[PDB]
């Protein structure tokens, strides 16, 4: 359909034009709002007082990585070379080679933490359900020699909290 | 078939057969092919001669308005023996339709600017000179947009290896920011996705 | 109209650098990976160049 | 009190819609286990691929190309105008 | 934890001293919370 | 030659190792022919795969799972 | 400082006072996109559409995911779309909270920024609870929405919406009829011509200028047809009647979010046919057929038939294109994106000749030019 | 080959052209060399210009010799103005880059198989 | 009417004879083209049928329907330019037969 805005005409009669000459010359407008709508300061401030208080999130949040393990640990990753092949940024790097018993596992697993674009494509391709984006924003170290991760940085970083992780998926896994 | 498959509509496909039937009728000096995309859009294959001419007919008429120029672009195909391609794309405000105009070329053969017909091909023609290398003559201005001042390669064509030929890095030995050949920290792995068996019978290339 | 016929074998120069004369390209029909029987990966004549050293970082 | 209506002396009055929602009237958590249904021809004994067919559809249908009482057919009918759409259209 | 009279500043925390090989007090960062409360203090649940 | 990079940096390496941590498992038995190996709990673990133990004494732990398994 | 969260360098030859000339240099953010999307598959290459602009997130990808479902002859299931209206029409509350403010931070005020972004936060949760991440979130796909939303959000959308029309009444008493602002903008940068069409401009700096057309109700999207709204229009072609659309266009949205919470029917989410959608994690993990379509679907992509398309949407600042050729196999061929910024800034040099220099800072802000998008 | 040429016709008006803009370069090297506040021997600036124009010497054709120009005609826009900041210019004369051997036996001890 | 509507225009003035100048002006000039190419067979056929509706009814308002332009004042600028092509149309020569078919295999899409 339509509408027409800013289409109006002044009335042009001496009952009006005072009302527009009691405005220009006496400032009866322009004190209407910012004499007032500004104050209106008397509302409670809104601030999350940071070092202590913190704000909301959701169980589907994305962040620092992990590699779980079952009960008594198997290093849940089977090195099926997938979370590697859907990765848009191509951070992941994986090198398998048959472990002594003959069950296969990894050797090098490196997520670069600069390239990773935080998809949620590597949480959703792993069929054996290993690699999982953690919910902790612990980060920010002082040397780029660092953020590159090896395998045996990840596991700890994913065994430091599994009380966080193992209780999110069981909220979220019923939807997908 | 209905539930998950996009329901078609015929009416739109009858008219854009007609209205495009006869623009091969009244400008046969130029137009060399026309067809109807199964989604109800048209593609007019036009010799490189008419570009300013044909649009000008499409520029005004009472049976075809096509005042709004939306998208100029290009495609570059090797093994087409005339490399590049243009595709003009025009919306006719009264009649609610899209009709695209394809015109081939090469690098060396110039093409003539559309700028007096529409004033919105002013930028879209400056760009293409940077990327693919097509050279538009009689253009009020020709310069360098989207690219740095150093790229002598005209990237988006198919011969530019993705990472360009010179990485950049700053060194304090003097006071400039200078350019040393490209040295990566990872190969840019090349995966290989193209699976056999030809899942599409309808598009089956000629038997040969 | 300025049709001006002539014949000069088309060549183009200056856009790449030294990789004009150093290398030798190759034009070949891909051979069908043999672990599977699908015959549709044939049918287009591609080209691909010589391979130079990849080292270790 | 003396500061309560001095917040109400300007901007009309609100006291119901208030910027910070900080007080109650929110949603609590996800308490219930949900169950997401799968409807759309998910069953057996009938659903048969090759009737559901999303893809495999033809090449763009051609029209006369190289090698009559026309009314000056336009691509479609011209547009009829709009209303003025009573809301407070001025 | 407050009386449920606020949203987002209703749930808060207190740091005290020298958690693990740590400077005493006026150093407080916020990566210290035990890896349980991320299921509480962040209002994820 | 390479070894001068982690000097003073203490060299993170993996205290535990799974190279074999497996063999400590009480390798199970069933009393039947073929079994269901879905591990680590339902719908978290390897895809279900059925293995045959009939040899004499061996089993087969499917190779996703690793956990020593037999009759 | 006046980069509007971007890095342009413009050069003007002014005549002693009046500008009368401008000729900007864009191309500071190019990054090399459309050369890099011939090299990635269809579902792998999605985000590089989300990272194009910084502000509208789910409104991009609504314009890609609609340019693929076509070539596939497939529609989402009903509960798909009625999401894509609730998020699709909730981010029109983002670019209209920004382009009234971070425009008017140039005019010099403070609070209409520090007063609002208290609130533009309360929205960013709702990207985080639904899927993952702070801003860029890859959620829409070729098959409709990724995964269902938690138990919740419908008491956090409702509870939040009925508070909001007040906030937008603290950007009104603080702006409209405040004189020092009215005088900074009226009859400034007026393009009323039929060049304002001839250039092919998109929505606002159209609809606020008279000529009356919009791509939401002249074309359907994804069920957009079944909800009622009115498209505000302007009087004279200056800026302060391109502002006044962007208030009366934030007071239309709260009609639709309020109209769209009542209708969402239960149903699946992904497209059903499963060649184009992955299966769940209950199904890929037991039966057989549910790998070979989950394990060939995460290496090569769909198979999407050859032939070219085009498409368009109404993005908060104007249209958005995708002209998507496809060669008949898994990786695409040209994917050519057009967003405004080849129009709304093609027309600065024209528009501003004959006003001062201290206007040209406040002309730009009305087009809503935001860069890295001119990666077009 | 039948396609319209760009500016030239055959080789003469063409090789009048390359002679021409030479001077626009030759007359203006140095006004920049004081303008960017870059320091070099001004004769270097007249060696490079003459080092480049002698480079592409084997060109057999019009519409090539016109193509190169359209590049060369441009640069005088940027350089005679200031659209470059010192570091788009000096990149012509490569200061930092260690030499290439280009001889034989100097290769054979460094680098595999060029 | 005082508002030209679609802005950039202005109402001046005469309806009902301002068109009739131009169609008639179109019809005469248009005839100078050879009669083979259908261009006349169309470009004219729309004008006559158009003009039949012009003559004659009030108000200008009900001249709007059955003649689909924009507002009348715009329909002129619809009829204004359709000339400015015609009087070029003899410069370059569409009617003549086709020139330079492409090199016989070009438009075939899947390479
Ligand atoms: S997690 Fe899934 S993807 Fe990542 S390695 Fe183990 S198996 Fe392959
Ligand atoms: S996180 Fe995002 S980016 Fe890093 S790997 Fe998984 S998907 Fe690729």
CA distance G102 to G11: 23
Query: Are the C-beta atoms of G198 and B67 separated by less than 8 Å?
Result: yes
Which among A133, A141, A173, A128 is positioned nearest to A157, based on CA atoms? A133
Phi, psi of A175, rounded to the nearest 5 degrees: -80, -65
**DSSP 3-state assignment of H45?**
helix
Two structure tokens written together for B117: 């017909």
User: Per-domain residue ranges for chain G?
Assistant: 10-367
Query: Are the C-beta atoms of B89 and B81 separated by less than 8 Å?
Result: no
Chain A residues whose CB is inside 8 A of the E28 CB are 51
Minimum-distance CB partner of I101 among D67, D70, D72: D67
Output Rg (C-alpha) for chain F, integer angstroms.
19
CA distance G293 to G279: 8
Two structure tokens written together for F52: 């045959």
Q: Write b or e for each residue in H85-113: b if 16 or more Cβ atoms lie within 10 A of its Cβ, otherwise e.
A: ebbebbbeeeeeeeeeeeeeeeeeeeeee
CA distance C46 to C27: 6
Q: Give B144→chain D minimum CA distance, Å.
A: 38
Residue F7: partners with Cβ closer than 8 Å, 6 or more residues away: none
DSSP one-letter string for C1-57: -------------SSS-STTTS----EE-----TTS--GGG-S--EE----------
Which among C50, C48, C46 is positioned nearest to C22, based on CA atoms? C50
User: Per-domain residue ranges for chain H?
Assistant: 1-114
Which among B60, B58, B119, B106 is positioned nearest to B80, based on CA atoms? B106
G22 is annotated as contributing to ligand binding: no
Two structure tokens written together for A99: 């472990």
Query: Are the C-beta atoms of D61 and B11 separated by less than 8 Å?
Result: no
DSSP H or E stretch at residue I60: helix I60-64
Which among B21, B34, B24 is positioned nearest to D62, based on CA atoms? B34
Query: Are the C-beta atoms of G94 and G315 separated by less than 8 Å?
Result: no
Cis ω for the linkage preceding I56 (within 30 of 0)? yes
Instruction: Write the residue with the smallest CA distance to atom 5 of ligand 1.
Output: A79
Instruction: Write the residue with the smallest CA distance to atom 2 of ligand 1.
Output: A126
A81 lines ligand 1 (CB under 6 A): yes
Two structure tokens written together for G284: 């890929």
- What's the gap in Å between D38 CA and the centre of ligand 1? 28
Instruction: Write the residue with the smallest CA distance to atom 8 of ligand 1.
Output: A80
Q: Could you write out the three-class secondary structure of chain G?
A: CCCCCCCCECCCCCECCECCCCCCECCCCCCCCCCCCCCCCCCCCCHHHHCCCCCCCCCCCCCCCCCCCCCCCECCCHHHHHHHCCCCCCCHHHHHHHCCCCCCCCCCCCHHHHCCHHHHHHHHHHHHHHCCCCCCCCCCCECECCCCCCCCCCCCCHHHHHHHHHHCCCCCCCCCCCHHHHHHCCCCCCCCCCHHHHCCCCCCCCHHHCCCCCCCCCCCCCCCCCCCCCCCCCCCCCCHHHHCHHHHCHHHHHHHHHHHCCCCCCCCCCCCCCCCCCCCCCCCCCCCHHHHCCCCCCCCCCCCCCCCCCEEEEECCEEEEEEECCCCCCCCCCEECCCCCCCCCCCHHHHCECECHHHHHHHHHHHCCCCCCCCC
Which among F42, F22, F38, F34 is positioned nearest to F59, based on CA atoms? F34
CA distance I25 to I29: 6
Q: At what angle do helices H42-53 and H12-27 cross, to 10 degrees?
A: 170
Distances (CA, A) of G240 to G93, G100, G207: 19, 11, 13
Query: Are the C-beta atoms of G52 and G60 separated by less than 8 Å?
Result: yes
Greatest C-alpha distance within chain H? 53
F50 pairs with which residues across the strands? F36
Side-chain half-sphere of C30: how many Cα atoms within 13 Å?
Answer: 15
| Count of CB atoms situated within 10 Å of the CB of G370 | 23
Query: Are the C-beta atoms of B151 and B88 separated by less than 8 Å?
Result: no
CA distance G347 to G363: 11
Task: Tell which of E5, E7, E11, E42 to mutate to test the D interface (max D CBs under 10 Å).
Answer: E7
Query: Are the C-beta atoms of G56 and G134 separated by less than 8 Å?
Result: no
- Experiment type: cryo-EM
Residue A138: partners with Cβ closer than 8 Å, 6 or more residues away: A64, E31
Chain E residues whose CB is inside 8 A of the A57 CB are 42-44
CA distance B187 to I16: 75
Which among E38, E42, E18, E36 is positioned nearest to E28, based on CA atoms? E18
Two structure tokens written together for A122: 């590597």
Side-chain half-sphere of I15: how many Cα atoms within 13 Å?
Answer: 18
A124 lines ligand 2 (CB under 6 A): no
Class of domain G10-367: mainly alpha
Phi, psi of G93, rounded to the nearest 5 degrees: -85, -5
CA distance A69 to D61: 56
DSSP state of A18: H
CA distance G373 to G53: 6
CA distance G231 to G224: 14
Residue D12: partners with Cβ closer than 8 Å, 6 or more residues away: none
CA distance H32 to H26: 12
3+ Cβ–Cβ pairs closer than 8 Å linking I and D: yes
Instruction: Write the residue with the smallest CA distance to atom 3 of ligand 2.
Output: A116
Dihedral sign from CA coordinates of F1, F3, F6, F8: negative
Query: Are the C-beta atoms of B130 and B144 separated by less than 8 Å?
Result: yes
CA distance E44 to A135: 10
**DSSP 3-state assignment of D13?**
coil
Give the experimental resolution in Å: 4.6
Query: Are the C-beta atoms of G235 and G241 separated by less than 8 Å?
Result: yes
Query: Are the C-beta atoms of A173 and G280 separated by less than 8 Å?
Result: no
**DSSP 3-state assignment of I30?**
helix
Testing ligand 1's pocket by substitution, the residue of A126, A129, A133, A158 carrying the most ligand atoms inside 8 A of its CB is A126
State the pairing for strand pair B177-181/B68-69. unpaired
Query: Are the C-beta atoms of G185 and G362 separated by less than 8 Å?
Result: yes
**To the nearest 10°, the Cα dihedral for G39, G44, G45, G48?**
-130
DSSP state of B6: P
State the pairing for strand pair A131-133/B41-46. unpaired
Distances (CA, A) of A157 to A124, A132, A151, E31, G14: 20, 11, 10, 13, 59
Minimum-distance CB partner of D75 among B16, B24, B38: B16
């Amino acid at each position: 359909t339509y509408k027409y805005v800013n289409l109006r005409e002044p009335s042009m009669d001496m009952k009006s034009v005072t009302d527009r000459a009691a405005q220009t010359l006496l400032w009866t407008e322009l004190i209407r709002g910012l004499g007032m709508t500004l104050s209106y300061l008397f509302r409670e401030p809104a601030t999350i007082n940071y070092p202590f208080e913190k704000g909301p999130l959701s169980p589907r949040f994305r962040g620092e990585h992990a590699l779980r393990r079952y009960p008594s640990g198997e290093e849940r990753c089977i090195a099926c070379k997938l979370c590697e092949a859907v990765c848009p940024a191509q951070a992941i790097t994986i090198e398998a080679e048959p472990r002594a018993d003959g069950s296969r596992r990894t050797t090098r697993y490196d997520i670069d933490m600069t390239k990773c674009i935080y998809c949620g494509f590597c949480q959703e391709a792993c069929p054996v359900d290993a690699i999982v984006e953690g919910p902790n924003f612990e980060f920010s170290t002082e040397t780029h020699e660092e953020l590159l991760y090896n395998k045996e940085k990840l596991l700890n970083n994913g065994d430091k909290w599994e009380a966080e992780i193992a209780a999110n998926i069981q909220a979220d896994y019923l939807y997908r | 078939t209905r539930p998950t498959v996009r329901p078609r509509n015929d009416v739109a496909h009858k008219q854009l057969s007609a209205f495009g039937e006869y623009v091969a009728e009244i400008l046969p000096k130029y137009v060399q092919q026309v067809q109807v995309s199964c989604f109800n859009e048209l593609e007019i294959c036009i010799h490189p001669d008419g570009v300013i001419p044909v649009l000008t007919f499409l520029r005004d008429h009472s049976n075809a308005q096509f005042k709004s120029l939306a998208d100029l672009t290009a495609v570059d195909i090797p093994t087409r023996q005339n490399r590049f391609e243009i595709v003009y794309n025009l919306l006719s405000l009264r009649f609610n339709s899209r009709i695209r105009v394809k015109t081939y070329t090469d690098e060396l053969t110039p093409i003539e600017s559309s700028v007096p017909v529409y004033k919105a091909a002013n930028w879209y023609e400056r760009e293409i000179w940077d990327m693919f290398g097509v050279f538009f003559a009689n253009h009020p201005d020709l310069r360098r947009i989207l690219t740095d001042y150093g790229f002598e390669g005209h990237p988006f064509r198919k011969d530019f290896p993705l990472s360009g030929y010179v990485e950049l890095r700053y060194d304090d030995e003097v006071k400039r920011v200078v350019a040393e050949p490209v040295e990566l920290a990872q190969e840019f792995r090349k995966f290989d996705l193209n699976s056999p068996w030809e899942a599409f019978p309808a598009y089956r290339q000629p038997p040969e | 109209i300025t049709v001006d016929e002539k014949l000069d074998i088309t060549t183009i120069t200056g856009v790449p650098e030294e990789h004009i004369k150093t290398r030798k390209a190759r034009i070949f029909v891909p051979a069908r990976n043999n672990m599977q029987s699908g015959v549709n990966n044939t049918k287009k004549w591609k080209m691909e160049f010589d391979t130079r050293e990849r080292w270790e970082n | 009190r003396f500061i309560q209506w001095l917040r109400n002396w300007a901007s009309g009055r609100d006291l119901q819609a208030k910027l910070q929602l900080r007080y109650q009237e929110i949603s609590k958590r996800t308490q219930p286990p949900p169950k997401l249904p799968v409807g759309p021809s998910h069953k057996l004994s009938n659903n048969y691929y090759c009737t559901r067919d999303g893809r495999r559809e033809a090449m763009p249908p051609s029209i006369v190309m190289s090698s009559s009482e026309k009314k000056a057919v336009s691509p479609a009918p011209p547009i009829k105008r709009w209303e003025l759409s009573q809301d407070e259209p001025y | 934890e407050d009386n449920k009279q606020f949203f987002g500043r209703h749930r808060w925390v207190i740091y005290t001293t020298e958690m693990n090989g740590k400077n005493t007090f006026w150093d407080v960062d916020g990566s210290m919370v035990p890896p349980e409360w991320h299921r509480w203090l962040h209002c994820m649940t | 030659y390479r070894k001068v990079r982690f000097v003073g940096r203490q060299k993170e390496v993996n205290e535990n190792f799974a190279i074999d941590l497996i063999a400590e498992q009480p390798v199970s038995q069933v009393g039947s022919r073929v079994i269901s190996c879905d591990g680590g709990g339902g719908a978290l673990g390897h895809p279900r795969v059925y293995i045959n133990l009939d040899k004499e004494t061996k089993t087969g732990t499917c190779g996703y799972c690793g956990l020593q398994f037999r009759q | 400082h006046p980069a509007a969260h971007g890095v342009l360098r413009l050069v003007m030859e002014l005549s002693g006072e009046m500008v009368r000339k401008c000729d900007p240099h864009i191309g500071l953010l190019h990054r090399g996109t459309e050369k890099l999307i011939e090299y990635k598959t269809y579902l792998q290459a999605l985000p590089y559409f989300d990272r194009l602009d910084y502000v509208s997130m789910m409104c991009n990808e609504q314009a890609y995911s609609l340019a693929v479902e076509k070539l596939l002859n497939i529609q989402p299931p009903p509960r798909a779309q009625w999401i894509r209206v609730l998020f699709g029409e909730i981010t029109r509350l983002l670019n209209h909270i920004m382009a009234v403010t971070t425009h008017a931070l140039d005019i010099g005020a403070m609070t209409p920024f520090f007063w609002m972004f208290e609130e533009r936060e309360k929205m960013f949760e709702f990207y985080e609870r639904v899927s993952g991440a702070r801003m860029h979130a890859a959620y829409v796909r070729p098959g409709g929405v990724h995964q269902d939303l938690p138990l919740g959000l419908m008491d956090d959308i409702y509870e939040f919406s009925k508070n909001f029309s007040l906030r937008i009444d603290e950007l009104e008493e603080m702006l409209t009829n405040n004189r020092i602002w009215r005088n900074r903008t009226v009859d400034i940068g007026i393009v009323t011509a039929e060049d304002a069409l001839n250039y092919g401009f998109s929505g606002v700096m159209l609809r606020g200028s008279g000529i009356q057309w919009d791509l939401r109700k002249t074309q359907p999207y994804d069920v957009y047809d079944q909800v009622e709204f009115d498209v505000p229009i302007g009087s004279r072609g200056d800026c302060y009647d391109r502002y006044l659309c962007r208030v009366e266009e934030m007071r239309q949205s709260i009609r639709i979010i309020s109209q769209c919470l009542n209708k969402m029917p239960p149903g699946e989410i992904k497209v059903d046919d499963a060649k184009v959608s992955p299966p769940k994690r209950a199904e890929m993990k037991t039966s057989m057929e549910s790998l070979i379509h989950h394990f060939k679907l995460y290496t090569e992509g769909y198979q999407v038939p050859p032939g070219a398309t085009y498409t368009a949407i109404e993005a908060p600042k104007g249209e958005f294109g995708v002209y998507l050729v496809s060669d008949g196999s898994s990786r695409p061929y040209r994917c050519k994106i057009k967003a405004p910024g080849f129009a709304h800034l093609a027309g600065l040099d024209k528009m501003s000749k004959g006003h001062m220099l201290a206007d040209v800072v406040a002309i730009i802000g009305t087009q809503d030019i935001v860069f890295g998008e001119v990666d077009r | 080959t039948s396609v319209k040429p760009i500016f030239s016709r055959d080789m003469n008006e063409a090789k009048r052209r390359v002679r021409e803009l030479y001077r626009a370069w030759y007359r203006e090297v140095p006004n920049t060399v004081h303008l960017f506040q870059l320091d070099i021997s001004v004769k270097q600036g007249r060696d490079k210009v003459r080092e480049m124009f002698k480079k592409n010497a084997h060109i057999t054709d019009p519409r090539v010799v016109d193509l190169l120009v359209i590049k060369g005609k441009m640069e005088l826009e940027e350089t005679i103005k200031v659209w470059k900041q010192r570091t788009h210019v000096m990149r012509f004369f490569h200061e930092t880059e260690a030499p290439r051997p280009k001889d034989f036996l100097s290769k054979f001890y460094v680098g595999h198989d060029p | 009417k005082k508002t030209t509507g679609l802005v950039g225009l202005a109402v001046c003035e005469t309806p009902h004879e301002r068109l009739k100048i131009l169609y008639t002006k179109i019809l005469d000039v248009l005839g100078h083209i050879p009669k083979n190419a259908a261009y006349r067979k169309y470009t004219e056929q729309i004008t006559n049928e158009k003009l039949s509706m012009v003559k004659a009814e009030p108000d200008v308002k009900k001249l709007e329907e059955r003649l689909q332009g924009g507002q009348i004042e715009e329909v002129i600028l619809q009829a204004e330019n359709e000339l400015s092509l015609a009087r070029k149309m003899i410069q370059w020569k569409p009617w003549e037969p086709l020139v330079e078919e492409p090199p016989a295999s070009q438009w075939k899409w899947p390479i």
